[PDB]
Amino acid sequence: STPDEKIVLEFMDALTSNDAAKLIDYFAEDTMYQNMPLPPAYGRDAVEQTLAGFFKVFSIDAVETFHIGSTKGLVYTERVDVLRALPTGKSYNVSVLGVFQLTEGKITGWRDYFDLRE
Amino acid sequence: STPDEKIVLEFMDALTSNDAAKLIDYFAEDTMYQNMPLPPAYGRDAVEQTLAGFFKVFSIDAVETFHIGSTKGLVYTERVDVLRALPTGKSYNVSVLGVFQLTEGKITGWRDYFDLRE
Ligand SMILES: O[C@H]1CCCC[C@@H]1O
Ligand SMILES: O[C@H]1CCCC[C@@H]1O
């Protein structure tokens, strides 16, 4: 595990906190999140708002990471998220790839590719 | 145009209002919206909240409908939406298929399939 992979794994562990204020601490000011293929959330504040909005409708009940690696400095990690819809109580399992760019220990770019098959 | 197709076309015309309170008038209490493959918004109130949340981050600047038809009572309609992200001012064109179920002139189900290719 490289230092960047370590940080990404810590962030993955933290997802089940469902706490945007806690999670945003991993991000640089100059950052972005893109949930493919939607337009990105530009800047740290937009990323925080995106997470906070998500946690008003879903709980991340569990994250099971099954792969992590790096190529050309970018960290690639794959997991299944157990997502529970708060207004219904129904739970869903979905696989997702996260691709992370870090600069001096902070996340400067995050791209997610969720499984979009039915 | 069947009576149901006419209603769906009125609804499509109304999208550029960016007004969830106006748009929800087309929906029955017993309704749902599913933006595929995400979990559905169950019930009229959830549909309204979904639209209202969307309009806080995007403007639908234009809708160009290029197909409408019906099969087995369901209305199928395809369009390109011009979506402008309010926090950035940037605009995006995206194709989408909407499938509508109507009961007594009100929408009881709505499924969207947006183009999810990069
Ligand atoms: O990976 C995260 C990305 C943002 C919301 C929940 C998901 O599990
Ligand atoms: O057609 C789209 C336009 C943007 C809001 C939701 C709807 O499904």
CB-based burial of residue B66 (10 Å sphere; 0-12 exposed, 13-18 middle, 19+ buried)? Answer: exposed
Is B81 among the catalytic positions? yes
Read out DSSP for A18-83?
--HHHHGGGB-SS-EEEETTSPPEESHHHHHHHHHHHTTTEEEEEEEEEEEEEETTEEEEEEEEEE
Can you name the residues that pair with A107 across neighbouring β-strands? A27, A102
In A, which residues are within 8 Å of B92 by CB distance?
A: 39
Place of tokens 């929408």: B107
Tell me whether B89 touches chain A (CB under 8 Å): no
Give the torsion sign (CA, B34, B39, B44, B45).
Answer: negative
In B, which residues are within 8 Å of A39 by CB distance?
A: 85, 88, 90, 92
State the Cα–Cα distance between residues B34 and B25, nearest whole angstrom. Answer: 18
Query: Rounded to the nearest 10 degrees, how much is the dihedral formed by the CA atoms of B71, B7, B10, B26?
Result: -120
Solving technique for this entry?
A: X-ray
The total number of residues written for chain B in this structure = 118
Domains of chain B plus CATH, in order, are 1-118 (3.10.450.50)
Query: Rounded to the nearest 10 degrees, how much is the dihedral formed by the CA atoms of B77, B81, B85, B89?
Result: -170
- Count, in order, helices (H) and strands (E) of chain B: 3, 6
Can you name the residues that pair with A76 across neighbouring β-strands? A69, A99
Tell me whether A21 touches chain B (CB under 8 Å): no
Instruction: Judge if the beta carbon of residue A19 lies within 6 A of ligand 1.
Output: no
Q: What distance lies between CA B57 and its chain's CA centroid?
A: 16
Please give the resolution of this entry in Å, rounded to 1 decimal: 1.5
State the Cα–Cα distance between residues A49 and A2, nearest whole angstrom. Answer: 29
